[PDB]
């Protein structure tokens, strides 16, 4: 005997106060029963299971499935119930690595571990919960009883406990071999390094050695695998990576489910295929929750899709991380609150790419969106490379300065430089800080009757200019805005406006440059045309003449 | 040598909080730190049978180059039962906020000499992540009292009142307060033998600890006596324009939500008419007088303004431009318990978030001194910008709560 270290067992408890499973064994055809008895006999021989008494009162049903085009049956135990009653675990799979964060590996070897898996024992006191019964021929006998000794396939803790047990074994090898990288995927270990391929198979032989210490063999009659490697939807090669081939279907009939699977692929692909747009395709998804609903494509959706197919007409690759060189991120405005980015280290060799969608709001502006994008990219880059990329951004240094220096919120982007590739992001208008001298002063106001929906909006000025317009199907908030719009419309290039609307102020102090309220847009459009605009607020109903004058005028 | 029994509040499970992305430098630091901690029995590796997690990161303390580990026990702390099984509470030293010099000491390291209740350990689980989730996360749990946990000052308190018995009795004029890993030491003397009394207070934590400490040599220097509150002030002009008067009235209308006898009748009456904003209005006697009466009112205190430890402290912050920030602490709207302003934020003249972060820390420190609890902040910043950067600037061992403000307050003016 070559003595072998035990895989240390992991103590597993049932959920608090809950008890195990007691589920009716399903009646089985004689054919399936014979099938199961064979399967379990061999498994018992392998130490995977053990016969139990009639004491153990737990049951999980078991089943038989004939593999398609194989006369063979396969055994399937339905742990769904026991999973519902087994505790929570610290699952590790939560984060999958992202190809762009890897380093190039000259040699990458693939080892099989479908046999190491069963070298992982199940906690002694928990085995009883895994009980099951193969029924007997004609129920003329007590159904044979079996319980598990290894992590059962399809149990809650199997993956978490399997993963962790392996890591625990691999840790000293990995740590004394810092020029090696190991990864766990299905029943398989993948090990790469960056050495000449003689020095590399050495270290594999060293690993096969190390694994043997726990009585583990990893078949040297290895796999037909060659580049690329299909893995978590990608295509990994020794020196590059891309998404697993993206093909956009042709259709003369697009449905809610059809377009859904079309954005998923576009979103998924947008991580390496540059300039990929969604929006007008996820627009057609708005609200409608019938998965079969044949939605019509706008003439924006067809042109966006035809912009996609053109980008997906040929493959592009991302590189791998070269820790020695800088990380750059570059963003572009795409309109309709769409941003698109590339992260790269040397010109044109992207590591990955992406898109950012504006946040669902009612008012917004380009500078805000760019910021949000920058932050999304920042967190993404911390996750993948452990650092913040340097930004190249289509916004003048001067514009950003004016923005953050005058914005009411705190704001920041990390190290960055201006990149002159239109459309540049700009501030469209800037409100005065003090009243303007020689500029006409417009006192505005608006009011509506909450029931009739009628109200009026208008202004009066120091120069005797007046207006009151009447309005149907409006609200107080709409009339206060409309009033401001009149004042902008009827004034010269410089103007002072006084309002009592907290609501209105709040919208314009957010400095939006696009809105969903066409009324706000009109105001923005007016603001853009002006040379100087001072907006001043005063409290309502305090008889501030000027204000009072037009309040009495619009509450008529 | 023997642990204190601990449990969570009834009906509440332990913390399961996502770990958030860490930079490479913070990972390296954390790995080295935890390697030594585990090597000293302060923490131990744990398995998958532990569903619990608390976030973790690294900071460099104020004027120091050494990385500190900082766990974010905010969730564990809400879910940790409250601590009344010897004491019924520490009747907050109302004299601490009245000293010429209050110094703040990192005594957190003393905690690690006391073991944690073996049954409670699972609840302190934390993960040092890996870049790109390549390697799997290192999972540790605590075997001792942890820095940042609500329980640590409570459990260790038995032992701390001890260590202080000498120095305390031998210096009965000093007020001493403990909040988390911080020890607040308030003298009334001169900064130089402050740096003597503080110096000799270090001794005991060495002296006791013998029967090196990492950030024990550190000292924060406050002055609650030169702590500047704020009144509300109206301008004093020779010439008032219509704009000047409109703003004045706006401000006064606002103070009236706070102060009772505030009147704007006579002042508005000057604003009778549709005048040009930049036009000068001379004041009437009736108005100059009403303005003067209003001034008298703003000088007095607010009425019926009480702290109630049963309740939450709320902190609002407004950005005023050019490095200045203004803030208010309260429990009921318009009943400020404290207001303040911050005017030249250190090494951050081009970084709004660094400033805002240091601001949040100063206000918290002040709130610990005055009320022995932290406030819940209302920050003028998008959640996503703040959530991305505040760790890079954080230099305190505790962490407050905060929510976000996405609508520009008019109130910003009234405090400028
Ligand atoms: C070694 C490895 C293999 C695989 C393959 C999965 C499949 N099928 C997937 C991953 C994530 C890894 N892990 C890994 N991988 C790295 N590089 C790499 C580089 C090229 C190829 S081709 C197939 N696998 C790889 C892996 C790497 N560099 C630094 N740390 C790293 N960790």
Swiss-Prot record, chain B:
So what does mutating residue 298 to S actually do?
A: 31% loss of polymerase activity. No loss of RNase H activity
Q: What is the effect of changing residue 216 to A?
A: No effect on RNA-dependent DNA polymerase activity. No effect on RNA 5'-end and 3'-end cleavages
Known outcome of mutating residue 291 to S: 59% loss of polymerase activity. 8% loss of RNase H activity
Variant or mutagenesis effect after changing residue 252 to S: 17% loss of polymerase activity. 30% loss of RNase H activity
The effect annotated for residue 398 to L is: No effect on RT p66/p51 heterodimerization
* Effect seen on changing residue 185 to I: 25% increase of DNA-directed DNA polymerase activity. No loss of RNA-directed DNA polymerase activity
Put simply, this protein is called p51 RT
Q: What organism, scientifically named, is this protein from?
A: Human immunodeficiency virus type 1 group M subtype B (isolate BH10) (HIV-1)
State the encoding gene: gag-pol
Tell me the part of the parent protein that is shown. Answer: 604 to 1027 of 1447
